[PDB]
Amino acid sequence: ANLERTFIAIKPDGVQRGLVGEIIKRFEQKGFRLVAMKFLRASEEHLKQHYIDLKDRPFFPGLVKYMNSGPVVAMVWEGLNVVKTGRVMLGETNPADSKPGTIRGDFCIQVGRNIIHGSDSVKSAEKEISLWFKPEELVDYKSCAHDWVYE
Amino acid sequence: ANLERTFIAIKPDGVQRGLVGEIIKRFEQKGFRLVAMKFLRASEEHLKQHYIDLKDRPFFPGLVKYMNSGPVVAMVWEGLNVVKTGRVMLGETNPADSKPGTIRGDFCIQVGRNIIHGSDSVKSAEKEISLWFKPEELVDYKSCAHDWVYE
Amino acid sequence: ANLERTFIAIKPDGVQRGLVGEIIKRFEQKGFRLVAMKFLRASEEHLKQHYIDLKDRPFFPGLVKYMNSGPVVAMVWEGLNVVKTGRVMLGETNPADSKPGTIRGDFCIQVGRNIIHGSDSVKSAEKEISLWFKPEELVDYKSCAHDWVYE
Amino acid sequence: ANLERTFIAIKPDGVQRGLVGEIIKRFEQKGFRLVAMKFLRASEEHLKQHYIDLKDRPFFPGLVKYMNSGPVVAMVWEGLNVVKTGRVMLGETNPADSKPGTIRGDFCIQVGRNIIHGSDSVKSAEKEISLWFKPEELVDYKSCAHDWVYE
Amino acid sequence: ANLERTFIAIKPDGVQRGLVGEIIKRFEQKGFRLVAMKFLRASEEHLKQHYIDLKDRPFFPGLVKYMNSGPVVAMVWEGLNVVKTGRVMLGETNPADSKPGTIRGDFCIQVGRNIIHGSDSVKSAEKEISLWFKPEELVDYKSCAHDWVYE
Amino acid sequence: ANLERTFIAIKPDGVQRGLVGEIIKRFEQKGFRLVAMKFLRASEEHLKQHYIDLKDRPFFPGLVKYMNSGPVVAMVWEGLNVVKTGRVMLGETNPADSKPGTIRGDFCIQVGRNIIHGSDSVKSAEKEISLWFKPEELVDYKSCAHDWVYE
Ligand SMILES: Nc1nc2c(ncn2[C@@H]2O[C@H](COP(=O)(O)OP(=O)(O)O)[C@@H](O)[C@H]2O)c(=O)[nH]1
Ligand SMILES: Nc1nc2c(ncn2[C@@H]2O[C@H](COP(=O)(O)OP(=O)(O)O)[C@@H](O)[C@H]2O)c(=O)[nH]1
Ligand SMILES: Nc1nc2c(ncn2[C@@H]2O[C@H](COP(=O)(O)OP(=O)(O)O)[C@@H](O)[C@H]2O)c(=O)[nH]1
Numbered sequence: 001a002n003l004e005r006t007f008i009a010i011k012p013d014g015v016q017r018g019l020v021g022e023i024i025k026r027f028e029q030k031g032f033r034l035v036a037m038k039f040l041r042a043s044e045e046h047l048k049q050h051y052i053d054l055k056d057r058p059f060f061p062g063l064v065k066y067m068n069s070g071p072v073v074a075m076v077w078e079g080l081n082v083v084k085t086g087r088v089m090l091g092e093t094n095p096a097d098s099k100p101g102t103i104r105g106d107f108c109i110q111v112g113r114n115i116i117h118g119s120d121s122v123k124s125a126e127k128e129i130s131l132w133f134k135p136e137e138l139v140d141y142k143s144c145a146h147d148w149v150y151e
Numbered sequence: 152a153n154l155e156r157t158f159i160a161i162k163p164d165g166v167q168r169g170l171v172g173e174i175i176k177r178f179e180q181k182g183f184r185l186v187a188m189k190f191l192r193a194s195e196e197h198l199k200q201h202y203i204d205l206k207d208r209p210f211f212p213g214l215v216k217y218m219n220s221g222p223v224v225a226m227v228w229e230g231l232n233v234v235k236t237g238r239v240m241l242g243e244t245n246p247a248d249s250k251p252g253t254i255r256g257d258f259c260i261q262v263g264r265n266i267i268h269g270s271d272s273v274k275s276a277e278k279e280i281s282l283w284f285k286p287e288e289l290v291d292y293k294s295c296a297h298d299w300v301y302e
Numbered sequence: 303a304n305l306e307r308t309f310i311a312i313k314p315d316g317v318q319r320g321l322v323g324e325i326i327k328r329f330e331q332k333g334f335r336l337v338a339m340k341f342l343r344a345s346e347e348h349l350k351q352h353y354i355d356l357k358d359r360p361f362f363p364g365l366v367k368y369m370n371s372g373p374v375v376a377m378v379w380e381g382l383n384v385v386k387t388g389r390v391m392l393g394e395t396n397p398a399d400s401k402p403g404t405i406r407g408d409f410c411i412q413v414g415r416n417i418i419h420g421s422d423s424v425k426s427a428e429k430e431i432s433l434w435f436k437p438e439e440l441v442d443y444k445s446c447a448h449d450w451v452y453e
Numbered sequence: 454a455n456l457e458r459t460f461i462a463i464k465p466d467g468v469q470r471g472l473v474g475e476i477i478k479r480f481e482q483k484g485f486r487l488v489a490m491k492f493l494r495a496s497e498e499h500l501k502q503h504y505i506d507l508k509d510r511p512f513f514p515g516l517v518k519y520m521n522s523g524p525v526v527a528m529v530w531e532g533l534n535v536v537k538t539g540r541v542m543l544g545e546t547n548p549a550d551s552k553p554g555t556i557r558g559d560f561c562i563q564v565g566r567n568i569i570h571g572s573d574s575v576k577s578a579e580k581e582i583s584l585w586f587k588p589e590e591l592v593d594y595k596s597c598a599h600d601w602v603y604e
Numbered sequence: 605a606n607l608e609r610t611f612i613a614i615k616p617d618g619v620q621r622g623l624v625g626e627i628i629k630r631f632e633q634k635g636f637r638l639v640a641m642k643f644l645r646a647s648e649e650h651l652k653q654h655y656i657d658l659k660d661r662p663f664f665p666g667l668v669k670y671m672n673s674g675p676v677v678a679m680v681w682e683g684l685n686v687v688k689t690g691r692v693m694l695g696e697t698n699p700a701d702s703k704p705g706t707i708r709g710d711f712c713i714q715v716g717r718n719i720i721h722g723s724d725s726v727k728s729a730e731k732e733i734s735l736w737f738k739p740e741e742l743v744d745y746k747s748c749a750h751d752w753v754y755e
Numbered sequence: 756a757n758l759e760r761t762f763i764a765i766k767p768d769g770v771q772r773g774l775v776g777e778i779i780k781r782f783e784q785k786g787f788r789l790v791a792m793k794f795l796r797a798s799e800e801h802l803k804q805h806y807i808d809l810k811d812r813p814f815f816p817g818l819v820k821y822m823n824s825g826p827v828v829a830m831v832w833e834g835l836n837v838v839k840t841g842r843v844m845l846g847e848t849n850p851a852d853s854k855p856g857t858i859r860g861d862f863c864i865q866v867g868r869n870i871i872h873g874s875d876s877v878k879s880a881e882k883e884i885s886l887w888f889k890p891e892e893l894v895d896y897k898s899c900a901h902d903w904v905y906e
């Protein structure tokens with residue numbers, strides 16, 4: 001089979017607060033497969049295109065500036081319902097609405113500093129994956145745990 | 152009802168994915184007393200009795216064969232509302248509906264590989280404990296912390 | 303706003319069960335600022351004042367005795383909505399109603415041994431802070447991570 | 454290969470202090486395979502035979518009484534060098550001499566309450582295994598990560 | 605029959621880097637009893653007294669300045685061999701020589717930002733406890749675990 | 756020497772055994788700055804250049820094959836003595852001799868599956884960094900904690 005994929009980015013605040021390993025561990029222990037990963041400071045234009053649907057929102061200027069203010073960890077993760085499940089794992093957009101046990105619930109306070117991004121839909125994921133990674137950067141392998149994670 | 156007991160089994164996938172100590176720690180940390188524990192490859196006939204209520208469901212033979220495909224860790228835990236609270240701790244039957252912070256929410260993806268079993272009621276717990284353990288295998292002792300966990 | 307403060311106390315059961323660091327870590331990693339902290343055996347009088355609204359409840363004598371039965375860690379934490387959010391982190395009054403991922407959800411079982419206290423409102427918080435701490439015991443400094451937690 | 458085995462027991466203090474899960478995780482994460490596990494109060498005669506080479510030592514009486522004073526978690530673990538590297542993981546007999554990051558180094562203080570036992574040699578391991586388990590209690594299965602742990 | 609005690613302070617970098625809980629957890633897990641604790645910005649004078657033995661060394665002014673640059677967590681811990689064992693837990697003065705598994709080994713790089721202080725000797729412990737704490741701030745109580753930590 | 760760099764790669768066994776987050780956290784927690792990171796299946800030729808000094812060793816062919824058998828996580832880390840300190844953090848080449856608390860000591864068993872690589876010297880580090888990364892992939896930014904990790 002060819003499993004669902006989602007795009008996950010650890011925002012500059014996640015990197016600056018030293019939560020990269022912690023956040024990656026949460027995806028690994030869940031049983032999702034890391035497909036791609038790189039580390040870069042995305043240009044304001046890259047970030048504008050990432051968040052193109054939000055361009056007319058008033059917080060958008062500060063969002064783009066915050067997102068370009070340090071490096072990000074960009075990832076692709078694979079598995080059954082990984083898009084929706086990735087989102088549940090993150091918590092709500094606002095850390096204030098995010099439950100203890102979620103990444104945002106556990107680790108942050110304010111919507112403007114909410115440490116992580118996950119694709120909100122499959123069609124979003126595929127667009128975001130194409131924008132952040134070259135095809136060659138997506139690694140096709142099989143997880144040793146697969147048959148212990150899936151029927 | 153401080154002497155309530157429940158049956159908890161770590162399924163073959165739980166054992167194979169190295170989650171035994173992680174699971175046990177969650178019960179220990181909560182204040183529940185470990186009463187019995189053993190490690191075995193349960194026979195197909197034993198598993199058919201365990202899941203006798205499901206013998207007509209289409210997933211039954213698959214479920215049995217998987218349950219026999221590796222060892223399980225069988226346990227008896229005791230404490231106030233341990234049956235219901237144990238259930239909460241595991242999360243929903245389907246990992247897709249299990250909240251972050253729960254065992255299945257944190258660690259698995261698919262209902263057919265859902266890493267753990269807990270009794271669904273006192274009556275089920277009593278049946279399961281009888282099925283899985285000899286009476287001499289239930290250990291009598293007082294937990295150190297009891298007077299700090301209970302009034 | 304961001305200068306809100308709350309009073310958090312680790313109850314004698316939380317100290318005795320070795321949960322002081324685990325509790326503190328949860329507040330630190332969330333991004334809240336530790337403002338004040340001390341360790342003491344609170345007098346029965348001090349405890350009666352802390353719980354003055356409950357003076358006529360049936361459980362109040364047992365409550366005051368339990369709370370005097372060992373030392374307590376008293377703390378003040380700062381941040382946006384720290385009162386409300388602190389409560390979310392603790393769980394519900396009754397650990398039976400507290401979800402996995404919260405302090406009571408993870409660690410305790412019975413309402414009379416529920417390991418921790420948090421102020422239920424800003425007015426409660428300011429009363430409790432005045433009750434437990436001398437003004438000089440409240441330390442003003444800026445958190446390293448502040449600008450990565452707050453826009 | 455017919456891989457080496459060792460006998461590990463978590464002593465009554467390890468059980469009472471809630472360290473069973475933690476300990477088991479350290480063995481699991483190292484890549485050792487759990488072969489056998491049970492939970493029991495070992496009789497004084499069982500304990501005398503286990504520690505027979507110490508019978509004339511002055512601490513022997515107290516050792517047997519303490520080891521009988523609560524249940525123990527009895528285990529057999531498999532792996533290349535598991536006896537010697539198991540000992541290294543435990544620390545030195547005296548926790549005072551055990552380094553941080555070892556089990557006794559992290560968790561205990563006094564030689565008479567040193568939380569765990571491990572076989573000191575291959576010959577001791579085989580003797581101890583034979584005395585603590587029935588042959589049928591030793592579960593034969595292959596670890597899913599075997600080929601990632603071994604050449 | 606007072607057990608041995610030591611003075612441990614979490615330095616300003618320790619607090620700023622959000623390691624207070626982690627650090628305390630290590631001492632609780634080991635079996636030491638928390639006797640005293642408070643949180644304060646130590647004055648230059650207090651710190652010159654604390655480090656008076658170093659007053660003529662080149663790094664002393666820099667040390668005293670750094671130690672005043674943020675609040676510190678000051679603690680008294682009790683147990684068998686706590687002064688020496690405490691030291692071993694911290695690591696060497698220079699993090700470069702501190703082993704993985706020690707506090708400085710896990711968390712620090714440079715000698716002037718080495719996150720924690722522990723007394724060097726019983727005589728120094730006694731002096732430091734007296735310098736930092738009033739007698740009434742030392743809490744006399746018996747630990748839950750004592751009989752499982754000590755024979 | 757604060758700008759010293761080393762090359763760390765999580766080997767395919769580390770990726771498959773779900774240790775990526777765990778490993779990254781240890782580097783983060785220590786205070787080193789992540790400079791560059793990517794995830795790829797390294798070609799046999801690329802790996803032959805990486806290990807060119809071992810090309811005549813009997814294990815060389817199998818080493819290259821194993822290192823190509825799954826993706827690796829390639830990283831550049833910066834900090835004072837990061838090459839030597841990084842080596843200490845990994846353990847010894849042989850897991851069998853690696854101390855508990857080190858990455859290999861904690862997580863692996865056999866030299867042929869030793870989960871991680873780190874440069875052995877500054878000269879080796881510069882050669883490996885150049886081999887594995889494009890100049891533009893070394894990210895320029897300041898770590899928020901720098902002034903709390905360094906004088
Ligand atoms: N400062 C600020 N940022 C916001 C606000 N709403 C959304 N954002 C940021 O914009 C990101 C994208 O918004 P959105 O797609 O609606 O939410 P998401 O998919 O859950 O991340 C969020 O993750 C926040 O980082 C806001 O009101 N203020
Ligand atoms: N393959 C498969 N297994 C299922 C399904 N539903 C339940 N199971 C398995 O059967 C076990 C028992 O089912 P059930 O008693 O209803 O759920 P539980 O009490 O929450 O464990 C579950 O824990 C699953 O492992 C399904 O639709 N497909
Ligand atoms: N024993 C007992 N203690 C209670 C009961 N209800 C509340 N308490 C205790 O009294 C404390 C204060 O009560 P309350 O303010 O209503 O709950 P809280 O603000 O969530 O802590 C609780 O945290 C419990 O420790 C009860 O029914 N029985």
Ligand SMILES: Nc1nc2c(ncn2[C@@H]2O[C@H](COP(=O)(O)OP(=O)(O)O)[C@@H](O)[C@H]2O)c(=O)[nH]1
Nearest residue numbers: 512515516545546564565566567570571573755
């Ligand atoms: N109370 C007490 N117990 C001891 C002493 N020496 C050893 N023991 C206990 O006896 C056990 C077995 O001793 P030994 O075979 O020499 O050490 P081990 O193989 O490292 O456990 C130790 O693990 C301790 O639990 C002592 O001096 N006093």
Ligand SMILES: Nc1nc2c(ncn2[C@@H]2O[C@H](COP(=O)(O)OP(=O)(O)O)[C@@H](O)[C@H]2O)c(=O)[nH]1
Nearest residue numbers: 663666667696697715716717718721722724906
């Ligand atoms: N900046 C700087 N600080 C130092 C140096 N040597 C020691 N210190 C600091 O001064 C503290 C006290 O030194 P000392 O009492 O000898 O070592 P300790 O008992 O390990 O803490 C150390 O823990 C360091 O924080 C140095 O060479 N430079």
Ligand SMILES: Nc1nc2c(ncn2[C@@H]2O[C@H](COP(=O)(O)OP(=O)(O)O)[C@@H](O)[C@H]2O)c(=O)[nH]1
Nearest residue numbers: 604814817818847848866867868869872873875
């Ligand atoms: N299969 C196998 N692999 C080995 C052996 N010795 C070394 N290796 C592998 O080759 C790598 C490089 O060896 P070396 O450069 O000498 O040590 P390193 O710098 O500590 O990794 C090791 O990290 C192992 O992955 C061996 O005897 N057998």
Ligand SMILES: [Mg+2]
Nearest residue numbers: 051053054120
């Ligand atoms: Mg969106």
Ligand SMILES: [Mg+2]
Nearest residue numbers: 202204205271
């Ligand atoms: Mg059922």
Ligand SMILES: [Mg+2]
Nearest residue numbers: 353355356422
């Ligand atoms: Mg109240």
Ligand SMILES: [Mg+2]
Nearest residue numbers: 504506507573
């Ligand atoms: Mg012996």
Ligand SMILES: [Mg+2]
Nearest residue numbers: 655657658724
């Ligand atoms: Mg000194």
Ligand SMILES: [Mg+2]
Nearest residue numbers: 806808809875
């Ligand atoms: Mg080499």
